C-alpha cells in the first residue's frame, strides 16, 4: 500500500501539472482570439484602402 501510495500520488501530481499547463494554454487560446482580432484588423485595413 506504500508502493501503491507512491504510484497514485505521482500520477495525481503529473495530472496536477497537466491541469495547470492546460490553463496556461487556455490563457494562450485567449491570445489566438486576438490573432483573430488582428486578422480582422487586416480585414479592416484592406477595407480602409477599399473605402478610401
Amino acid at each position: 500500500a506504500k508502493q501503491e501510495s507512491t504510484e497514485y500520488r505521482r500520477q495525481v501530481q503529473s495530472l496536477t501539472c497537466e491541469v495547470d499547463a492546460l490553463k496556461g494554454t487556455n490563457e494562450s487560446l485567449e491570445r489566438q482570439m486576438r490573432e483573430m482580432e488582428e486578422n480582422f484588423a487586416v480585414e479592416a485595413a484592406n477595407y480602409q484602402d477599399t473605402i478610401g
Partner: peptide, 8 residues
C-alpha cells in the same frame, strides 16, 4: 483588397 480593386 478585391472590393478595393472592384469598387475602384
Amino acid at each position: 483588397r478585391l472590393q478595393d480593386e472592384i469598387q475602384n
